[PDB]
Amino acid sequence: IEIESSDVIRLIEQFLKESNLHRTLAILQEETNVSLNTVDSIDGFCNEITSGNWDNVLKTVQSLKLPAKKLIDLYEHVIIELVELRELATARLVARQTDPMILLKQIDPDRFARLESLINRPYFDGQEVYGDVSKEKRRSVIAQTLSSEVHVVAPSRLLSLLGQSLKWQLHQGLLPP
């Protein structure tokens, strides 16, 4: 006697995705508060954020369900690593035109002001920023915090499992009732 609720829902959601039933996927995720968070590998996801390849991690994040706090943390740190790389244009662009940053601007004005202040400083004061908590530790923390919100599911897992039930029925049989 084995039971599981959320995993089944996730299977169904994957099936819906593969079958181009987008509306039903949306409605299901909305109704059951369970989201399809498929990543090729959690190791690859963590490794991608740790290595600092922000394009990839932000694409993947754009494919995910979003807790506002985790997104504003992530996007904030992305901006920090941007202003460290002296890519000020992109940093400002993210600061003004991305949803988590707008939300941050609304709910926590002092924090966003602090971020823009960091962007507007003549040089990058890495000493304070990464002195409190290092870059490696920040990317690690964000990596864990986001990894908890994702799942890895084989390409067509539901159909595979149904095929397996079919094999079970054929080669073992069904218990009498």
Partner: peptide
């Protein structure tokens, strides 16, 4: 635009 490749890709993805 951005001289950096990952930043450029980031720009395309975000915007």
């Amino acid at each position: 635009h951005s001289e950096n490749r990952m930043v450029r890709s980031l720009h395309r993805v975000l915007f």
